[PDB]
Design a protein around this nucleic acid. Sequence first.
DNA 1: TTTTTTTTTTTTTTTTTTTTTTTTTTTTTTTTTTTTTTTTTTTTTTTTTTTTTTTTTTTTTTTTTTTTTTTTTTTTTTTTTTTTTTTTTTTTTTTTTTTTTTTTTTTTTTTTTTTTTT
Length: 49
Amino acid sequence: LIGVDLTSGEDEVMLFSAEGKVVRFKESSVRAMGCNTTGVRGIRLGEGD
DNA sequence: TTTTTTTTTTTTTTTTTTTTTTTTTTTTTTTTTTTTTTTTTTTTTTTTTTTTTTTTTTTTTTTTTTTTTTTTTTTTTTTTTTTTTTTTTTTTTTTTTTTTTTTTTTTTTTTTTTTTTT
């Protein structure tokens, strides 16, 4: 499913919150400007559940 | 004066078509059955002061495994093309307004005759 969707601008740092006690931060500018009906880019090597 | 040719509507009854009585399938419609909303009050739940012993964060230091890292080659991403769907101009058709032209039906009442059934 889709975890959550927020509307953001360039150079705004985004954080994740795993349900197995994890939190990460990657500048949003690192990742390429995606398009519709495409695949996805990995973010977090979240092992297990 | 007798006798000879031709013309059509009827004895027609049968073939073709039309008209008129019929009853399977998807679209309506009334019923029962399950989702919603407002009150009473009711034990019951729940909001807020005081005290208390607790158990997790912050002085300080340690390491190691996730954060550094560079690079090969994949493969998702993007490009062009074409098909399918959505949506809006365009057109067509139909309805209502008020003076005109035309029509068409259902029943009482009595008395007499046809026209079927028993």
